[PDB]
């Protein structure tokens, strides 16, 4: 009867499929805090980051994988962690389960066995057990059907400049001589190497009822007290594929600025003749990659990154058996409630980060162009009263609108408690048809630890760039 009750409870939730699944957040955030009027007053904030191919991690990734190693038989609560590729695996002892491992070719009887329900004992013990068996009995013969996938995208370009100028002045009195010589040389190099391959593929046996989720003696009331309401559902890991992933990225820049001026003179009286030169060399070399696959011999070469990396890795480790061990790549979990809601996550999860600042956090304004813009820094400021109502006292900056031709640098540090900040940095283009232009504009900006707003360019193409960091 308990099992039936558990099933009825699971059936009862009628959570919307689109809204519930689409439960994500934004970029940065901020949360204030005020209580009482006799102690102190502080404020904090919260920001979020994302990874993909730019700023990735390997150790971190590995750690994440270990945390969510529910290849078969899982139950992640659909709330926030799931969407962020990192939820909880809270699940009471359940019934036995079976996992199939389709490959190049195997037996039927041995193909499917019997697995229990643990964290990293049966799933890792059973899978590994069978995995070794295949490599043991089956020496070679059949070839593992591994789907290869790798794309290469490089981008290298250089730029040169040779400006020569030579003129001399001579009148019926004084004689002069000018000499200008400068050369420009700037070339950049960009190349992105990618590589992916999946061989191992684990799958689970769809669930019919709560027989796999809960055992004989289950508690529908004790399990609901933990964290199983209507807002969040129980998500269980579906299938899983193994394999590796070859990564490679490197970029090298170069620039040269040689200045050589030659001045000559010979006027009736004094003889001045001087000549100065100039030199400047800038180099930038950076390389980084990651091999999720997990190789050895053909691993060092790839890591270094030369010419025989991809090939050396895609020619020595073809036959997937034991030579090259696999590694968790993709991840797929299913919702154990109505055999419908299925989530499709990746392998790289986002890393949360939250800090606090007592009286830190100031706004900087770096202007380096050939245009006159009027900064409109204006923000409000709350405050507690004797009764218990939060008042408001807007206080605009001292320089609320005015022309400021380059160079121009400043910064409006914060000030304890605050809220809202209207800034209007409209650059003056002048022209003839218009008069005022609005480049950058943001409403109710988030109190960032260290935000910077600089605009590089001329009076035609505003190349503004806002910098917001929170170390």
Author numbering: 1 to 471
Direct quotes from the study:
Gram-positive bacteria, including the common wound-infecting Staphylococcus aureus, the virulent food-borne pathogen Listeria monocytogenes, and Streptococcus pneumoniae that causes pneumonia, utilize cholesterol-dependent cytolysins (CDCs) to attack and kill mammalian and human cells. The bacteria produce and release CDCs as water-soluble monomers that attach to cholesterol-containing cell membranes, where they assemble into large, 200–500 Å cytolytic pores. X-ray structures of pneumolysin (PLY) from S. pneumoniae show that the soluble toxin monomers are roughly rod-shaped and consist of four domains (D1-D4).
We determined the structure of the ring-shaped ~2.2 MDa PLY pore complex by cryoEM. In total, 6461 ring images were combined to generate a 3D map with 42-fold symmetry at 4.5 Å resolution. The elongated two-stranded β-sheet of D2 rotates from its vertical position in the x-ray structure by 90° around a short glycine linker to an orientation parallel to the membrane plane in the pore complex. D2 connects D1 to D4, and its rotation results in a roughly linear translation of D1 by 35 Å towards the membrane surface and by 30 Å towards the pore centre. In the pore complex, both bundles refold into four 85 Å β-strands, which form two parallel β-hairpins that insert into and traverse the lipid bilayer.
